[PDB]
């Protein structure tokens, strides 16, 4: 009755856990609002400000964050959030809403769903 | 060690709690 996804950037990996909740989003045991690169806050809050609070009605997301740097971690977190929402709308919500979210996310920023293939080279 | 190596596939986002998650977990070399 829940969804377990991941999002990656270079080495940083975030694992997102989406479930029937009450509109609470917390990452690595802490809210998104208080994570230290607050100059990079709006990249963290990306699907919330693109989608609004309504699409987070009964949604509880807990994300583990591990590896990488700082910026790579932020991009991994936001990719994990978007992928968790998409997979929940695949599994428990209708198809049309999911393809609507995929349309708006691909139209806005490609990285939010598909990962950067490039990684540090030997 | 060498036999415990596990490889994912990424298409819809992978759901680890989906019963069809094994279809997106690889054990051998692609290509």
């Amino acid at each position: 009755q829940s969804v377990q996804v991941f999002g990656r950037k270079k080495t940083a990996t975030a694992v997102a856990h989406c479930k029937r909740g009450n509109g609470l989003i917390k990452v690595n045991g802490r809210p998104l609002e208080m994570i230290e690169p607050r100059t990079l806050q709006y990249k963290l809050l990306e699907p919330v400000l693109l989608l609004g609070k309504e699409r987070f009605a009964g949604v509880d997301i807990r994300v583990r964050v591990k590896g990488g740097g700082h910026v790579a971690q932020i991009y991994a977190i936001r990719q994990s959030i978007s992928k968790a929402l998409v997979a929940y709308y695949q599994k428990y919500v209708d198809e049309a809403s999911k393809k609507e979210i995929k349309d708006i996310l691909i139209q806005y920023d490609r990285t939010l769903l598909v990962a950067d293939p490039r990684r540090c080279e030997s | 060690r060498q036999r415990s190596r596990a490889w994912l596939k990424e298409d819809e986002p992978l759901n680890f709690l989906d019963p069809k998650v094994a279809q997106r977990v690889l054990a051998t070399q692609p290509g």
Binding site: Q4, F6, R8, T11, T13, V15, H17, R62, R64, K66, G67, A115, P117 | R5, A6, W7, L8, K9, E10, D11, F16, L26, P30
Partner: peptide
């Protein structure tokens, strides 16, 4: 890219198992 790679996916599966276990704890 269509596949994650050995090491990153190993870390991802360990992370997902740990998160599932800590949600099972509470």
């Amino acid at each position: 890219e269509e596949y994650v790679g050995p090491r990153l996916s190993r870390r991802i599966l360990q992370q997902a198992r740990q998160q599932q276990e800590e949600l099972e704890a509470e």
